[PDB]
Amino acid sequence: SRPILEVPESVTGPWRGDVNLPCTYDPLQGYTQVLVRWLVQRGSDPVTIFLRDSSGDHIQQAQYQGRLHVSHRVPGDVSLQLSTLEMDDRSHYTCEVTWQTPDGNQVVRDRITELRVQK
């Protein structure tokens, strides 16, 4: 039926190193990826830190420009790579993908993961 996001409940990354937050799905006929959003939890809101759409990749925040990259080569792999991990990077991250469906409407799916940072 619908695409299925595959996201681990938690990921451990090395302090000062790099980590991949996996977010993948098996592509399905008739479902066209139209948006990928990654968010991080701060307070009452998850805040957007990355968007990919038909105009390309968008990292609005200067603090993430140059340390945040999202997988692109393999269809269905939209894992987030975070570089030079800080203790402050420990948080819940949300991977959210939007598809156009065979019927012509849209569907959105999201999954939360926790990043822990280990010395």
Short mmCIF file of N, CA and C in Angstrom, two decimals, residues 4-99:
data_model
loop_
_atom_site.label_atom_id
_atom_site.label_comp_id
_atom_site.label_asym_id
_atom_site.label_seq_id
_atom_site.Cartn_x
_atom_site.Cartn_y
_atom_site.Cartn_z
N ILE A 4 6.86 2.83 3.57
CA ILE A 4 7.13 2.54 4.98
C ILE A 4 8.50 3.12 5.34
N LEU A 5 8.52 4.09 6.25
CA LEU A 5 9.78 4.65 6.72
C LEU A 5 10.42 3.72 7.72
N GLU A 6 11.73 3.55 7.59
CA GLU A 6 12.53 2.69 8.46
C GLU A 6 13.50 3.60 9.19
N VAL A 7 13.29 3.76 10.49
CA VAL A 7 14.08 4.67 11.31
C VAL A 7 14.35 4.02 12.67
N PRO A 8 15.62 3.87 13.07
CA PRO A 8 15.92 3.29 14.39
C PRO A 8 15.40 4.18 15.51
N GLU A 9 14.99 3.53 16.62
CA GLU A 9 14.53 4.28 17.78
C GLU A 9 15.66 5.14 18.35
N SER A 10 16.90 4.67 18.26
CA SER A 10 18.00 5.47 18.76
C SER A 10 19.28 5.13 18.01
N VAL A 11 20.17 6.12 17.97
CA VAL A 11 21.48 6.03 17.33
C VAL A 11 22.51 6.63 18.28
N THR A 12 23.67 5.98 18.40
CA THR A 12 24.78 6.51 19.19
C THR A 12 25.88 6.99 18.26
N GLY A 13 26.31 8.23 18.45
CA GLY A 13 27.34 8.82 17.62
C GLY A 13 28.55 9.25 18.42
N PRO A 14 29.72 9.28 17.77
CA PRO A 14 30.96 9.60 18.50
C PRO A 14 31.16 11.10 18.63
N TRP A 15 31.41 11.54 19.86
CA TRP A 15 31.72 12.94 20.12
C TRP A 15 32.89 13.40 19.25
N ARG A 16 32.71 14.56 18.60
CA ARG A 16 33.65 15.18 17.65
C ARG A 16 33.68 14.49 16.30
N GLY A 17 32.99 13.36 16.17
CA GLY A 17 32.92 12.61 14.94
C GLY A 17 31.66 12.90 14.16
N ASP A 18 31.30 11.96 13.30
CA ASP A 18 30.15 12.07 12.43
C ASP A 18 29.22 10.89 12.67
N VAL A 19 27.93 11.10 12.46
CA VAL A 19 26.95 10.04 12.62
C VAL A 19 25.93 10.15 11.50
N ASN A 20 25.38 9.01 11.10
CA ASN A 20 24.26 8.94 10.18
C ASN A 20 23.02 8.61 10.98
N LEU A 21 21.97 9.42 10.83
CA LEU A 21 20.68 9.07 11.39
C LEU A 21 19.88 8.39 10.29
N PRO A 22 19.74 7.06 10.33
CA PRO A 22 19.14 6.36 9.19
C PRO A 22 17.67 6.70 9.03
N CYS A 23 17.28 6.95 7.79
CA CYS A 23 15.87 7.11 7.44
C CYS A 23 15.72 6.64 6.00
N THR A 24 15.08 5.49 5.82
CA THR A 24 15.01 4.88 4.50
C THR A 24 13.61 4.33 4.27
N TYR A 25 13.31 4.11 2.99
CA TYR A 25 12.09 3.43 2.60
C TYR A 25 12.34 2.74 1.27
N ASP A 26 11.60 1.66 1.03
CA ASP A 26 11.66 0.96 -0.24
C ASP A 26 10.75 1.69 -1.22
N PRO A 27 11.27 2.24 -2.32
CA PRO A 27 10.41 3.00 -3.23
C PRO A 27 9.30 2.12 -3.78
N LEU A 28 8.12 2.73 -3.96
CA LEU A 28 6.93 2.04 -4.44
C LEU A 28 6.43 2.71 -5.71
N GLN A 29 6.02 1.89 -6.68
CA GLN A 29 5.48 2.41 -7.92
C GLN A 29 4.33 3.38 -7.66
N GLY A 30 4.34 4.50 -8.37
CA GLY A 30 3.27 5.47 -8.28
C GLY A 30 3.37 6.45 -7.14
N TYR A 31 4.35 6.28 -6.25
CA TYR A 31 4.61 7.22 -5.17
C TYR A 31 5.83 8.05 -5.54
N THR A 32 5.64 9.36 -5.65
CA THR A 32 6.68 10.30 -6.02
C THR A 32 7.07 11.09 -4.79
N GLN A 33 8.33 11.03 -4.40
CA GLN A 33 8.83 11.83 -3.29
C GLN A 33 8.79 13.31 -3.67
N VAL A 34 8.09 14.13 -2.87
CA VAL A 34 8.01 15.56 -3.15
C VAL A 34 8.57 16.43 -2.03
N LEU A 35 8.79 15.89 -0.83
CA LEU A 35 9.40 16.66 0.24
C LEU A 35 10.07 15.73 1.24
N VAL A 36 11.25 16.14 1.70
CA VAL A 36 11.92 15.54 2.85
C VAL A 36 12.22 16.66 3.84
N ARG A 37 11.81 16.48 5.09
CA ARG A 37 12.11 17.43 6.16
C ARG A 37 12.77 16.69 7.30
N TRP A 38 13.86 17.24 7.82
CA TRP A 38 14.42 16.78 9.08
C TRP A 38 14.21 17.87 10.12
N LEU A 39 13.74 17.47 11.30
CA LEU A 39 13.51 18.38 12.41
C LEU A 39 14.26 17.89 13.64
N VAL A 40 14.56 18.81 14.54
CA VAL A 40 15.15 18.49 15.83
C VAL A 40 14.26 19.08 16.91
N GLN A 41 14.17 18.38 18.04
CA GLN A 41 13.31 18.80 19.14
C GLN A 41 14.06 19.79 20.02
N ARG A 42 13.41 20.91 20.33
CA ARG A 42 13.96 21.82 21.32
C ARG A 42 12.98 21.98 22.48
N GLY A 43 11.90 22.72 22.26
CA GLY A 43 10.91 22.88 23.30
C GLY A 43 9.55 22.37 22.89
N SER A 44 8.55 23.26 22.90
CA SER A 44 7.21 22.90 22.47
C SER A 44 7.17 22.45 21.01
N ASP A 45 8.23 22.72 20.25
CA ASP A 45 8.21 22.44 18.83
C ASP A 45 9.43 21.63 18.39
N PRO A 46 9.24 20.73 17.44
CA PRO A 46 10.35 20.39 16.55
C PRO A 46 10.60 21.55 15.60
N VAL A 47 11.87 21.87 15.38
CA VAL A 47 12.24 22.95 14.48
C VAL A 47 12.86 22.32 13.23
N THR A 48 12.53 22.88 12.08
CA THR A 48 13.10 22.38 10.84
C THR A 48 14.57 22.75 10.76
N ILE A 49 15.42 21.79 10.42
CA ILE A 49 16.82 22.07 10.14
C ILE A 49 17.21 21.73 8.71
N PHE A 50 16.41 20.97 7.98
CA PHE A 50 16.74 20.60 6.61
C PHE A 50 15.44 20.37 5.85
N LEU A 51 15.41 20.81 4.59
CA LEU A 51 14.33 20.52 3.65
C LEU A 51 14.93 20.19 2.29
N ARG A 52 14.40 19.16 1.63
CA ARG A 52 14.69 18.90 0.23
C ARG A 52 13.38 18.88 -0.54
N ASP A 53 13.31 19.65 -1.62
CA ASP A 53 12.13 19.69 -2.47
C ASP A 53 12.60 19.82 -3.91
N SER A 54 11.69 20.20 -4.81
CA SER A 54 12.04 20.27 -6.23
C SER A 54 13.09 21.33 -6.52
N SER A 55 13.32 22.27 -5.60
CA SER A 55 14.34 23.30 -5.81
C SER A 55 15.69 22.92 -5.22
N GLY A 56 15.81 21.75 -4.61
CA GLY A 56 17.06 21.27 -4.05
C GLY A 56 17.04 21.23 -2.53
N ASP A 57 18.24 21.33 -1.95
CA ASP A 57 18.43 21.20 -0.51
C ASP A 57 18.49 22.56 0.16
N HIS A 58 17.83 22.68 1.31
CA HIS A 58 17.70 23.94 2.02
C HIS A 58 18.08 23.75 3.48
N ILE A 59 19.18 24.38 3.88
CA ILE A 59 19.62 24.44 5.27
C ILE A 59 19.63 25.93 5.62
N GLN A 60 18.58 26.37 6.31
CA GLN A 60 18.35 27.79 6.57
C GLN A 60 19.34 28.34 7.59
N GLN A 61 19.74 27.52 8.55
CA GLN A 61 20.46 27.98 9.72
C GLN A 61 21.96 27.93 9.49
N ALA A 62 22.62 29.07 9.71
CA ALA A 62 24.06 29.16 9.50
C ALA A 62 24.81 28.13 10.34
N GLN A 63 24.31 27.83 11.53
CA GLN A 63 24.96 26.87 12.42
C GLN A 63 24.98 25.45 11.88
N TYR A 64 24.10 25.11 10.94
CA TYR A 64 24.09 23.78 10.35
C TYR A 64 24.67 23.72 8.95
N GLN A 65 24.79 24.86 8.27
CA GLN A 65 25.36 24.92 6.93
C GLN A 65 26.82 24.49 6.96
N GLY A 66 27.13 23.34 6.36
CA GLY A 66 28.48 22.83 6.37
C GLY A 66 28.72 21.66 7.30
N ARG A 67 27.73 21.28 8.12
CA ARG A 67 27.85 20.13 9.00
C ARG A 67 26.66 19.19 8.90
N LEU A 68 25.73 19.45 8.00
CA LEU A 68 24.51 18.66 7.87
C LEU A 68 24.36 18.29 6.40
N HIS A 69 24.29 16.98 6.12
CA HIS A 69 24.12 16.48 4.76
C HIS A 69 23.15 15.31 4.76
N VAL A 70 22.34 15.21 3.71
CA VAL A 70 21.31 14.19 3.63
C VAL A 70 21.61 13.32 2.41
N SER A 71 21.51 12.00 2.60
CA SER A 71 21.81 11.05 1.54
C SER A 71 20.95 11.32 0.31
N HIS A 72 21.53 11.05 -0.85
CA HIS A 72 20.91 11.47 -2.10
C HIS A 72 21.08 10.49 -3.25
N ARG A 73 22.05 9.57 -3.20
CA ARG A 73 22.36 8.79 -4.39
C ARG A 73 21.39 7.64 -4.61
N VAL A 74 20.95 7.00 -3.54
CA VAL A 74 20.14 5.78 -3.62
C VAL A 74 18.68 6.19 -3.40
N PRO A 75 17.77 5.89 -4.33
CA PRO A 75 16.37 6.25 -4.09
C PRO A 75 15.85 5.60 -2.82
N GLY A 76 15.14 6.39 -2.01
CA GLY A 76 14.60 5.91 -0.77
C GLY A 76 15.50 6.09 0.44
N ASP A 77 16.76 6.48 0.26
CA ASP A 77 17.67 6.74 1.38
C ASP A 77 17.74 8.24 1.60
N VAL A 78 17.18 8.70 2.72
CA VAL A 78 17.22 10.12 3.07
C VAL A 78 17.80 10.28 4.47
N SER A 79 18.78 9.44 4.78
CA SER A 79 19.47 9.50 6.06
C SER A 79 20.17 10.84 6.24
N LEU A 80 20.20 11.32 7.48
CA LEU A 80 20.84 12.59 7.80
C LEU A 80 22.23 12.33 8.38
N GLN A 81 23.23 13.00 7.82
CA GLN A 81 24.60 12.92 8.32
C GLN A 81 24.93 14.21 9.05
N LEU A 82 25.31 14.09 10.31
CA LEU A 82 25.67 15.23 11.15
C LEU A 82 27.16 15.13 11.47
N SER A 83 27.89 16.21 11.23
CA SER A 83 29.34 16.23 11.33
C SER A 83 29.80 16.98 12.57
N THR A 84 30.93 16.54 13.13
CA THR A 84 31.57 17.13 14.31
C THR A 84 30.55 17.26 15.46
N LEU A 85 30.18 16.10 15.97
CA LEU A 85 29.12 16.01 16.97
C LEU A 85 29.51 16.72 18.26
N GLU A 86 28.55 17.45 18.82
CA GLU A 86 28.64 18.13 20.10
C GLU A 86 27.71 17.47 21.11
N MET A 87 28.05 17.60 22.39
CA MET A 87 27.13 17.13 23.43
C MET A 87 25.74 17.72 23.23
N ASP A 88 25.67 18.98 22.78
CA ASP A 88 24.41 19.67 22.51
C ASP A 88 23.59 19.02 21.41
N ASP A 89 24.19 18.16 20.59
CA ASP A 89 23.45 17.55 19.49
C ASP A 89 22.55 16.42 19.95
N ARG A 90 22.71 15.96 21.19
CA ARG A 90 21.81 14.97 21.75
C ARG A 90 20.40 15.52 21.75
N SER A 91 19.49 14.82 21.08
CA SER A 91 18.11 15.28 20.97
C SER A 91 17.33 14.22 20.22
N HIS A 92 16.02 14.44 20.14
CA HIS A 92 15.16 13.66 19.26
C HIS A 92 15.08 14.35 17.90
N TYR A 93 15.29 13.57 16.85
CA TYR A 93 15.24 14.06 15.49
C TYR A 93 14.08 13.39 14.77
N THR A 94 13.41 14.13 13.89
CA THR A 94 12.28 13.61 13.13
C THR A 94 12.61 13.60 11.65
N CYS A 95 12.40 12.46 11.00
CA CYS A 95 12.49 12.34 9.56
C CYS A 95 11.07 12.32 9.02
N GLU A 96 10.77 13.22 8.08
CA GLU A 96 9.41 13.36 7.57
C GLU A 96 9.44 13.41 6.05
N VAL A 97 8.70 12.51 5.40
CA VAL A 97 8.73 12.42 3.95
C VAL A 97 7.31 12.55 3.43
N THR A 98 7.15 13.28 2.32
CA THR A 98 5.86 13.47 1.67
C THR A 98 5.94 12.89 0.27
N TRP A 99 4.92 12.14 -0.12
CA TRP A 99 4.82 11.58 -1.46
C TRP A 99 3.52 12.03 -2.11
#
